[PDB]
Each structure stands twice: as C-alpha cells, then as structure tokens.
Design a protein around this ligand. Structure first.
Ligand SMILES: CONS(=O)(=O)c1ccccc1
Ligand SMILES: [Zn+2]
Length: 258
C-alpha cells in the first residue's frame, strides 16, 4: 500500500506512515499576500544556473525528475533568506487534471495549473542525504505555471515525456538549461517548510516566486499523458499529483518586495 495521490493512499493517508505530515512546518501553504510582510533584511536573491549540467529525466511514479550532476560547484542558489550556498540537484512539477488546479502553494487561495520545484541542498552539509537531516538543509525555488502562451524553454522537457510514460522509465537528458524556465521577476515570498511528498521532511526554506511563467495548453496536456503506473499495468493518468495547503501554524511568510 505504497503512498500516492489516490483516495486510499493520498494526502489524507500519509500521516499514518509519516507522522510528520501533521508537523509544525509542513508545506505547501496558502500565501495570504496581505498578511505577508516585506522583509528589509532579505539580501538580493542569486540564481546562477549558467553551468548547470543535466543528466537524466525519470518517471518515479509520482512525477518526473530532471536530475543534475551536483558533484561540482555549479547551478547555485544563494542570497535572499539563505545563509551560504545551495546546489541544484533536480527539478520536477506538480500539476492538475484541469487548468483550474495543480499547484501546491496557493496565492490568496488561488490555485495555478501547475508548480515547478527546483530543489537545492545546502553545500555546508556535503550532500543531499546529510542535508535532509538538517533544519536548513534544503532550498526549493517554487514557480507557478499558468496556461496561456507556450514556454519555449520547456518544450525539450515536454518532447521527451513520451519516452518515460510509465513508472520506472528514465531517459538521458543532457544539456538542458533550467534558465529557460524562469520568469522575468525574482520577487518572492519565503517561509520555512517541508518537502511536499513523503517523507515530508521539514528541511526546506521555501522561495516562491510571485510571477508565474506561462505554458501552453498543449504543453500541460502532455504532462497529463504520463502514467502513475508501470509498463504493462492498468493506465492511471499522472494528474493531480499535488498536496493541498497545510496549516501555517507558528509561521510568518516574508515578502522580498513592497
Ligand atoms: C519540494 O517538494 N517537492 S517533493 O516532491 O516533495 C520533492 C522534494 C525533494 C526531492 C524530490 C521531490
Ligand atoms: Zn515538489
């Protein structure tokens, strides 16, 4: 009875195997824009993906991961609310079955069609494994996706999805530049949270961009053709792989802008 997004193994069931699901700093959360406060102590955010080197794309049965070679000091996120340097390890998305839903974080209760998560680990911890055992081990840059004009830089990802339709399939995915997935503005909201999928570890400093990127209906429709199941198994479309907003509890969301 492996965790998932269905009626019998979805978000409402996760707490049984992962008690931290009802923790003190769980994600995602609704971002109440009027309650968020501009933070003057936030330093300029720095996204340096010029030397990013992708290796492979994988369908893990929950989403698809574009993995990067993080053995060297490349693709770094720093500044903003972060102390030190965080290295990019992979990115993935969460999306819906319809354009009206799909994002994990919400803005004033508004749900976007999807949400991109660029995952980075704190280099002071050596690697990802050790980093997820620390309260400041990860930094995730979240970017909302709305349906409208196509995002040229996303097409290469879209076109390779037909080769990793089912759970367990992977394909070489080199030379992909994640800079093509970033919106113009780096204005953001930040708060301490967790991974949004089991084990739901609370090691994430969230940096959610205010400006969404636009992707075409055709592009997101191809996301929805992926499968949760493995090859040779009954088809269950990979849609609505998002966790709903969780209690903000003892937290404050800070804004990088006025
Ligand atoms: C950031 O939340 N996205 S997640 O699906 O929980 C995830 C976190 C870290 C590595 C892979 C997936
Ligand atoms: Zn995610």
């Amino acid at each position: 009875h492996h965790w998932g997004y269905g009626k019998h193994n979805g978000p409402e069931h996760w707490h049984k195997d992962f008690p931290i699901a009802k923790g003190e700093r769980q994600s995602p959360v609704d971002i109440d824009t009027h309650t968020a406060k501009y933070d003057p102590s936030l330093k300029p955010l720095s996204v340096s993906y010029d030397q990013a080197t992708s290796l492979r794309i994988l369908n893990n049965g929950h989403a698809f991961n574009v993995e990067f070679d993080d053995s060297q000091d490349k693709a770094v996120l720093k500044g903003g609310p972060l102390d030190g340097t965080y290295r990019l390890i992979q990115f993935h998305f969460h999306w819906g079955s319809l354009d009206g839903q799909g994002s994990e974080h919400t803005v004033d209760k508004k749900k976007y069609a999807a949400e991109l998560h660029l995952v980075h680990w704190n280099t002071k911890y050596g690697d990802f494994g050790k980093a997820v055992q620390q309260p400041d081990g990860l930094a995730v840059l979240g970017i909302f996706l709305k349906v409208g004009s196509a995002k040229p830089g996303l097409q290469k990802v879209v076109d390779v999805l037909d080769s990793i339709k089912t759970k367990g399939k992977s394909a070489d995915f080199t030379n992909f530049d994640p800079r093509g997935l970033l919106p113009e503005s780096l204005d953001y909201w930040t708060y301490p949270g967790s991974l949004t999928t089991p084990p739901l570890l609370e090691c994430v400093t969230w940096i959610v961009l205010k400006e969404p990127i636009s992707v075409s209906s055709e592009q997101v429709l191809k996301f929805r053709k992926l499968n949760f199941n493995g090859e040779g198994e009954p088809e269950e479309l990979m849609v609505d792989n998002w966790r709903p907003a969780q209690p903000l509890k003892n937290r404050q969301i800070k804004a990088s802008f006025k």
